[PDB]
A paper describes a structure:
Aminoglycoside (3″)(9) adenylyltransferase [name] from [name] belongs to the ANT(3″)-Ia family and catalyzes the magnesium-dependent O-adenylation of streptomycin and spectinomycin at positions 3″ and 9, respectively. Modification of streptomycin and spectinomycin by O-phosphorylation or O-nucleotidylation prevents the drugs from binding to their respective binding sites on the ribosome (for reviews, see Refs. 9 and 10). In the apo state, [name] has a monomeric two-domain structure with the active site located between an N-terminal adenylyltransferase domain and a C-terminal helical domain. We here present crystal structures of wild type (WT) [name] with ATP or ATP and streptomycin and of an active-site mutant in complex with ATP and streptomycin or dihydrostreptomycin.
The structure of [name]([name]) with ATP and streptomycin ([name]([name])–ATP–sry) was refined to 1.73-Å resolution, and the structure of [name]([name]) with ATP and dihydrostreptomycin ([name]([name])–ATP–dhs) was resolved to 1.4-Å resolution. Dihydrostreptomycin only differs from streptomycin in the reduction of the carbonyl group at the 3′-position, and because this position does not show any interaction with the protein and the two structures are virtually identical (r.m.s.d. of 0.2 Å over 261 Cα atoms), further analysis will be based on the dihydrostreptomycin structure. The overall structure of [name]([name])–ATP–dhs is very similar to [name]–ATP (r.m.s.d. of 0.3 Å over 252 Cα atoms). Dihydrostreptomycin is bound between the two domains of [name] with the C ring sandwiched between the two domains in proximity of ATP, whereas the B- and A rings extend further toward the surface and form their major interactions with the C-terminal domain. [name] hides 417 Å2 (58%) of the van der Waals area of dihydrostreptomycin and makes interactions with all three rings. The C ring is the site of modification and is situated in proximity of the suggested catalytic base Glu-87 (mutated to glutamine in the structure) with the 3″-hydroxyl situated in the closest position. Furthermore, the ring is also oriented through a hydrogen bond of Asp-182 with the 6″-hydroxyl group and a stacking interaction with Trp-112. In turn, the B ring is oriented by His-185 through a hydrogen bond with the 3′-hydroxyl group. Finally, the A ring displays multiple interactions with the enzyme. Hydrogen bond interactions occur between Trp-173 and hydroxyl groups at positions 5 and 6, between the backbone carbonyl of Ala-177 and the guanidinium group at position 1, and between the backbone carbonyl of Asp-178 and the 6-hydroxyl group.
Residue numbers in the entry: 2 to 262, 264 to 269
Write the structure that this text describes.
């Protein structure tokens, strides 16, 4: 261990074999990461995969990969036997040596099903979240193909990890920026706050529990509602809660650290 949860082994092997067959000789590695390995696998959770390749895929490779991942993935919650897949593809040359912000070659996920069905695919593009993804994989991941992460990737400088953690925080500003993703944003803000304060990464649920006793009660109530929905215990009316979510976002913007809290950098 680390270990692949038995309940996802079959689908994870099928995804691995598809990605291997389509990418052929450009494939460098495939890593399983996220809550399946780090903890907190819930009924709606996806299976998170990072695919490292040497050269860009042809349009043929990309089209085949997208269409066949549609058949291997299901919408979150539709099935207990066939989960949503999230597959991010990255060029090795964006990570070794690092390019900041790094780009991602391709992204599959269920939120893109309607577009992907019609052959509409996001182009390669810069994404600061890749710094966070590789940082998490260096701590907790399983190589399904290729080498263990610590033999393949190198840590980003703290200065760049700081920028990657604060980029989404600065970008959430208006009601429309958060509508449709209320509990997800509230919980991700708790995770960002936890990482900047401790230098560590933790699950959505554990980050909420870490932050709750530190908040004034009004902000603790919004965080509790987000946590309780994520845990399956009650679905809120987020239209009614939107003004309090906006206040929570602004409180986090005002209070989250602007540099790692040092002896508490990520190591
Ligand atoms: C890349 N992961 C997906 C992606 O996650 C994003 C998410 O991104 C959403 C933004 O938070 C949200 O503000 C934005 N809304 C507006 N621009 N109005 C959403 O569009 C954005 N979602 C998205 N781009 N799919 O929040 C980031 C912290 C993320 O987890 C990084 O991985 O989108 C989520 C749906 O929104 C999916 O559940 C995730 O699987
Ligand atoms: N400090 C942080 N700690 C962890 N993830 C963070 C942090 N800041 C931003 N994120 C980003 O939030 C996303 C978390 O991915 P995802 O929603 O799949 O979560 P998960 O932990 O696997 O839980 P789930 O079981 O709900 O899928 C990633 O894009 C990750 O890089
Ligand atoms: Ca996940
Ligand atoms: Cl778990």
């Amino acid at each position: 261990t680390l270990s692949i949860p038995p309940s996802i082994q079959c689908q994870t092997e099928a995804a691995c074999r598809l990605i291997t067959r389509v990418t052929g000789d450009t494939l460098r590695a495939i890593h399983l990461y996220g809550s399946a390995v780090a903890g907190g696998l819930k009924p709606n959770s996806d299976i998170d995969l990072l695919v490292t390749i040497c050269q860009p895929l042809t349009e043929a490779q990309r089209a085949t990969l997208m269409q066949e991942l549609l058949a291997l993935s299901s919408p979150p919650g539709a099935s207990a036997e066939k989960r949503a897949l999230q597959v991010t593809v990255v060029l090795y040359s964006q990570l070794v040596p690092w390019c900041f912000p790094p780009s991602r070659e391709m992204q599959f996920g269920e939120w893109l099903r309607e577009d992907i069905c019609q052959g509409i695919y996001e182009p390669a593009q810069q994404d600061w979240d890749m710094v966070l993804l590789i940082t998490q994989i260096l701590e907790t991941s399983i190589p399904l193909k290729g080498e263990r992460a610590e033999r393949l990737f190198t840590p980003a400088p703290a200065a760049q990890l700081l920028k990657a953690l604060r980029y989404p925080l600065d970008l959430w500003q208006s009601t429309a920026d958060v509508q449709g993703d209320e509990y997800h944003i509230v919980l991700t803000l708790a995770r960002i706050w936890y990482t900047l304060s401790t230098g560590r990464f933790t699950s959505k649920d554990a980050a909420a529990d870490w932050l709750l006793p530190q908040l004034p009660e009004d902000y603790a109530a919004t965080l509790r509602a987000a946590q309780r929905e994520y845990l399956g215990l009650e679905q809120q009316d987020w239209h009614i809660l939107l003004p309090a979510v906006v206040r929570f976002v602004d409180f986090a913007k005002a209070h989250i650290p602007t540099q790692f809290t040092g002896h508490h950098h990520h190591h």
